[PDB]
Amino acid sequence: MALEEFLKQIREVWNTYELDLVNYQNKCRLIRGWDDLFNKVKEHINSVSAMKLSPYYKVFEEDALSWEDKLNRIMALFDVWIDVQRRWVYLEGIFTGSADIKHLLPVETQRFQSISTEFLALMKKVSKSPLVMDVLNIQGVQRSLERLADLLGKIQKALGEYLERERSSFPRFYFVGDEDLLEIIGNSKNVAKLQKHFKKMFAGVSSIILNEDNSVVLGISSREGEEVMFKTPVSITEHPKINEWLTLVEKEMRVTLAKLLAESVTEVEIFGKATSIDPNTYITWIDKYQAQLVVLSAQIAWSENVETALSSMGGGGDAAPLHSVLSNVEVTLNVLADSVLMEQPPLRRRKLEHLITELVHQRDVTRSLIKSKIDNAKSFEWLSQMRFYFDPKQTDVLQQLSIQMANAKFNYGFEYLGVQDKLVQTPLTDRCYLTMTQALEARLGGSPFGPAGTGKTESVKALGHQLGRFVLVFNCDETFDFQAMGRIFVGLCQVGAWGCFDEFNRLEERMLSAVSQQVQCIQEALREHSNPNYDKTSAPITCELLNKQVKVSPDMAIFITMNPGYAGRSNLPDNLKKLFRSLAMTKPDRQLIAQVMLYSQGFRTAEVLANKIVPFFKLCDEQLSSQSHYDFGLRALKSVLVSAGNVKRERIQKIKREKEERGEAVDEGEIAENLPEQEILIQSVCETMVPKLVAEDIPLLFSLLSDVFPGVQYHRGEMTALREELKKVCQEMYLTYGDGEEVGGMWVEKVLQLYQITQINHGLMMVGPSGSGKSMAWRVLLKALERLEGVEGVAHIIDPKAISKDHLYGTLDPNTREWTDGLFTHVLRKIIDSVRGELQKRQWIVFDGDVDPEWVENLNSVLDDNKLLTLPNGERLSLPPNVRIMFEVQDLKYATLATVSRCGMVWFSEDVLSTDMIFNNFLARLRSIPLDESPMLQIQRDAATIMQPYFTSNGLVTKALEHAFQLEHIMDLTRLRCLGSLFSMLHQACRNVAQYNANHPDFPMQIEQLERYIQRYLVYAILWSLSGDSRLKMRAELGEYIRRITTVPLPTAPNIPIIDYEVSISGEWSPWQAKVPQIEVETHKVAAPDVVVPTLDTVRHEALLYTWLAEHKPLVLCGPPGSGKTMTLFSALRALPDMEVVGLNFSSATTPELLLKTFDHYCEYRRTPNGVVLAPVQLGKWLVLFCDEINLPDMDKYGTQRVISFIRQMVEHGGFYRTSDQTWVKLERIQFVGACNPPTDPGRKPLSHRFLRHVPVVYVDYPGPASLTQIYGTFNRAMLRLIPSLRTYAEPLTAAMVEFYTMSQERFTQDTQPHYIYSPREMTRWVRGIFEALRPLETLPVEGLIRIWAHEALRLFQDRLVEDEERRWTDENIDTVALKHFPNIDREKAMSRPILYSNWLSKDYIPVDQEELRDYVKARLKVFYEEELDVPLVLFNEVLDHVLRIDRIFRQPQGHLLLIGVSGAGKTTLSRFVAWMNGLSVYQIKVHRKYTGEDFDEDLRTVLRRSGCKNEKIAFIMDESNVLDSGFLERMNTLLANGEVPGLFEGDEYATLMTQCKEGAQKEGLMLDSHEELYKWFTSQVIRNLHVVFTMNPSSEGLKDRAATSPALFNRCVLNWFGDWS
Amino acid sequence: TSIAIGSAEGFNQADKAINTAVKSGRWVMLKNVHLAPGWLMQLEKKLHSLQPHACFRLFLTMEINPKVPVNLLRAGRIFVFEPPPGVKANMLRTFSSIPVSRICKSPNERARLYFLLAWFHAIIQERLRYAPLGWSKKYEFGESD
Amino acid sequence: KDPLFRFFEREVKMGAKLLQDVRQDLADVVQVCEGKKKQTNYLRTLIN
Amino acid sequence: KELKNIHVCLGGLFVPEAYITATRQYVAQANSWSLEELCLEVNVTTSQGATLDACSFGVTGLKLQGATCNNNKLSLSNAISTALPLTQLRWVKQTNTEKKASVVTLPVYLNFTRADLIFTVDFEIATKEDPRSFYERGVAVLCT
Ligand SMILES: Nc1ncnc2c1ncn2[C@@H]1O[C@H](COP(=O)(O)OP(=O)(O)OP(=O)(O)O)[C@@H](O)[C@H]1O
Ligand SMILES: Nc1ncnc2c1ncn2[C@@H]1O[C@H](COP(=O)(O)OP(=O)(O)O)[C@@H](O)[C@H]1O
Ligand SMILES: Nc1ncnc2c1ncn2[C@@H]1O[C@H](COP(=O)(O)OP(=O)(O)O)[C@@H](O)[C@H]1O
């Protein structure tokens, strides 16, 4: 009765729930309460889904479907209404607040007024009936929303020019994106909505402070909560314009800080020159003033104290008051150290740490001054230091403070910095400060360079924050062109902000050279601003930037951070390098960094710990094995030190908690004294360094820890509550859970280590070989953390290499300068916006793919302390604290140290996931998940029980797996490829049992029969899964090893291998030869494209392919070309009537676009409540994508094939990403089959191990001499039935064919020439050539048959030969082979010197005489001159042979020609002459200087339309010189093999083609109406009507290059080596 | 007029500067022309069919890249800039580049300071010819220093 | 436990693995130059 | 035990720096000292095969560039290279007794390219030679 109650609750909720409306400026009633509306739908949808689980759901199935439909409609309606309403709010303000937009953008205003009125019209309709059900039933409310969303988007992108004008009024808008700027201008009245954009315009201002009216800006606030109250609040009522009052806020910001600093300086002067300091008074002063002002006041007080002391020492022989300055610094430092030791508020604690860090530097400087005996204030030992001077008598508060270093004079910009992590002022930092300040005084830029993690960009920010400057970090890549960099400079010029362009060398060399012009003129403007003759009352300093006069603020500075020797970076031009002062930041003073940080964090043994941890990392670097994911630099030390402070705090907070529970004792001194600080440091080291360690390096580091830290042990605290959460999650996902040394204990430890890295680093990386448990580790943890903490976990899995870099991060339009978000940018921006509460969920962005510096260094700022995604359009996206950037990779061989140091590494060795864990997962899923979607489950449970003894450690499967690794295979062996193939085959065995039960309803299988079938099939499946991709000899070698070790009954044949036996459904071994009959092919079907002569190899492979195809498992056939992979696959597919196959030909230039175009033609995208589903157009049919050359696509310099990465993501994850709108598309009823040559063959690249994990591989070798005799002896027997007299010669005819083919295959190989590939395809053409000749003839003697046999051998094996001795060998051996297998014949009659056959002098194909042929060709050539081409030709014997070879190809379906020879040999002229005689129409593309890829596509469509729709035979003659781009061959490669191009006809071209195809089909009297039928007819017509002739020079390297760029040229085109004239 | 080659609009500024200078008689310098060898061939063709002003001069700055068109090298006059052969030549180049007025200012000791700077610069630059012994790597001790 | 044995064992491991790879590669080169085995993609690079 | 008393060619080692760290670890473990407290001192003996004490390790194949070593005293030489017969690397406690004003820290580069630095050796000068002159003449030590 509970199902009624749930429906009653849903019904009553939706009959009363009204849309909550709020009046908006007396214009309309906007909908409010978005989260509650969505959560109600989500919980009701889940409740209905839970209701579907109950067995009593059927009686209420119908009514729940209506509620399920209605809830989906409600969600879909308001999923768009939330975006439409939001876009209207800030668009209305822009088109109403500004009275000037109606003139600059008149038409855009007119569109909005029409759209606004319709939107306001829908306001009243919703307001009349606020009920959700009422507004859901509005006629066409959904479609009205989609148009409104679309139309509002059109106006949004049409405001780019208006926004650019707005950015000039407030220069800080240059760093705000277009959408955010529109929200800023539109929502000026709604100031409360502007608080999320202040972090993008100001260094430390996160929000502003307003009164209750929200009309006067009382002050500003930072992210940490620190607030600065304006001395004179800024009124928005008096300055309504957004840019006007924003400028006042910025101006009041500097004035308030300048006034507050003066008050802070006055107060801190009491602390200075004081022997004793009251801690209570000092803490009160610290809490009173802002963090940047407290540190600044201390610097001013210390510098004045030192300067006063040096002035007193100006007498030379006087005393040393510098000791008093050092004493005051030490007394102040002791108070700060004491305060940190006790508990402080988080804001005060950071202020104390900042004060300690600087006063340590002040103490060090004062000691240096005392040691070197400086008595003059003009001494460079004091001048080289940074000094602060305050002038209270200055009228301008902004000029009271002056910062001086060496001869460089600076003014504090008074930018509110909030609270920033101050760096330790190391000697390297002093060198950096000295060098960059010298560059600033010279008005040059700063160029700190060095390796990764040396603190270069942090030092630039620290120096900028030291001078009170606004420092902007830009992560530079190759997309920062001249316009993007110039616009950034324009913003920096007007704002007066520092530009820190990290990774500046990643720009293109031409871009770096072009940018140098903009840097040079900015510096010249800055230099002339420094002239004392210049007066600020005169014209302001301007510079030429992007053909405009841009004012240059004196506070601008340009800094570039570079790694010279790293990969993926360019070389800077010399004229650019002279504009920057370079400093080598190679060895950071890490010892001082550790000592100061630990001292500021409250460690009593900071000096001892720093002297221990700093060498420890150096020892680890020099002792541990060199691995690509190892980094023990400053970043690794920085993370350990930061963790040490966090671990100490939680331990102190922990110890206080037992003390208050156990008694009453809260003393900070006692806790600090009895605190194992040395244990704390090791805990941070273990939590950060151990996960990255390989198995062999763990003992080395632990030995290092014991020797560096003797007597100190680390016990990993058990994360108990997480472990039961992991155990429950692992149980539900059929995973193996273990504790410590149990099964799966290592994997659980890796999950726990991965959890610790999440709490420490925002950027994670999972490094480990394929099948190590990386994906399952983070998936289980994400779901377990959701249960443990109650926070929903959302994961965004991205394959960065399956798409281009433009589609991953975004692109800037070269013309309109409009930014389009990429895959990562759109995902990150959606989380940041938090329209649907993405900020309250745990967001994990996983990068599952290869990592190279081209794409991964764009995340350098994201993975850094900046936590910022900087785009070339000046927009920066702050990483939310709940977002983690995770990488799941198999290696880091190509990643640079810049990214390795930026992430926390967790290493997943292959021993982490043991084989028995995979066996447990397979058995658990088999016993639980039914295969059909229960009698099927019962079969699986019985089968799993039988297979349980074998699927154990050291069992049959494990031993067979270990032995198979010793044998070599056609592709690299992986554990999961064999296991994945084995598991799929066993699933077929269960389906076989279910089929038998259905076929025998009265007598199902018993236990005794099931054991026999399952045990025997397991051995059969083991043999074909481990040795499937190996040669025949090692298929028997595995079988011999199995026979030695297994106890399952096996065939008793003394010599027949087990691989030759199959398992009958009755549970008995049966030979495969029993299924191989001696068939009799029909005479008219001799060697037909679909006729298959059954052999031992064919029956075994078809059954193997059927098992894998029926499970919809991706699979690959490997072998030499022409082996029979395509033949075997299509034969096996004929046994599956519900699967349609689509052929794709891969080449070197193949990209995922080829797959996408096939999806467009054959599949459709549909909107579902679960997302986008891509399914074939035909319902109920499974689409099979047959890729024939998977290993040809070019692998880039970083070892990745994009199309392979596309398929791997689209096989493992069951879908891909549509780059049009950055949405996930899930495949349905789509299957993949691959074919390839061995990876050792030229032009073939080995497939990725990650790709090969999901794809079993079967090796199809060439048929043997016995098989060749059987296959073509049957064909010869059927073909020779035309002439009964010749039937006796069928056996010797096959023997001669086999022998000559074998001899030619051995004599000529790919070592000599790339095209010397001989396969059974040549044998098949040999049978067709004789059959086509014999067919017209009623009778023929034995000599005539041998002449036909010799003629076909010459055309098949000698036409492609290059050298004359190769052709002479073929001529001689043809005579010997014919004479041996056919004795006592008339050799002269059969082996006459010119073997020429032609159908020009007769009706049939009969031998022709050379003189008679010459006379006929001469007569035809005469007529050819007046009609087509008036170019005289000289007839010699080779031309007569060549025109016959061209004629024979032109008479065959899909007959393409590849003519190779020197230019001027007559290849084109003969082709045109023969095509004219054969009735073909010669087509040649008229290439020229401006010919492009689009013109080639137009020409291809013209040819296909004429030859496919108009039934016109066309001889498409193309030359290698006509190939102006690699896309020319890519289109030709697809057309040569399939006879069609998937993406050639799109849009109107496709519609026009179908119109022509319908007319063409009608003219043929064909009943074709559907588009699919018309296209199939169009493709068939093109195949039989279009002949392509390719002419190219006989180059050596070019011939091999064409073999990979256009594989169809050497597999579909008949190669005729014309060569040069002999 | 100085233009840095490498941007699409950089070619437009180069063409506009040359077109105006051949009539006005000004000087046009294009830097890093080796980064655009294809446009260099067009530039050489444009220069061949041209009758510029008597005072017009065009300077092309490159890095002795092997991809510089041969026809451009033959058409123009080549000047190779490299480290001076020795200490004596190094100091002569330094003293010539620095203006005479700069060395001779109010402090009479400025001249000796420049001489020491010239000698110091010459010594370290010549040590670069012996890569392992003079230094540890080929440092870029040039005019900017 | 001995650090010297740990280092010397590791040096032997890399040395033995590199020794086996180099000797196997040279043996394959001899076979190709003797016309007794087929040339692969990696062998073409190694021989070149 | 024999692994401690073998003479090791630093140039022939795959990772020479691991050996220096490994010898540092052995001395600290045997003498119950901390790793960071250990300091390296160099002693060149003409007689190869000389007995090594508990904390001395013999490394051979070192080449001295631009100088000759006699009685553990460095002297400037006009020869390109000078072979060091047997270099005894000894790990000792840090006594921070400052420099002797005749001690020069010579880099020990792996090879003649002077690209990778293994460690540094604190040799002492003989006679009236200038430590600046060693710096100016590029005096260094090469493993191979
Ligand atoms: N803890 C576990 N217990 C049982 N089976 C497991 C466990 N972890 C992983 N597996 C199984 O082992 C295989 C490893 O798959 P997984 O996705 O975890 O590997 P991976 O290292 O991420 O692989 P890849 O490099 O292909 O991304 C899968 O079949 C998975 O179901
Ligand atoms: N058992 C068989 N029966 C008939 N023909 C066969 C048999 N085995 C091989 N062949 C011949 O071998 C050729 C195989 O070529 P194909 O399958 O296209 O090679 P690939 O799959 O490598 O592209 C076919 O032309 C076919 O005639
Ligand atoms: N057998 C021949 N006798 C006389 N001239 C010939 C002969 N074959 C080719 N030519 C000459 O070659 C020219 C055409 O060359 P073409 O066939 O287009 O070169 P390619 O063979 O490279 O396509 C014609 O002008 C013709 O004079």
Ligand SMILES: [Mg+2]
């Ligand atoms: Mg940086």
Ligand SMILES: [Mg+2]
């Ligand atoms: Mg994975």
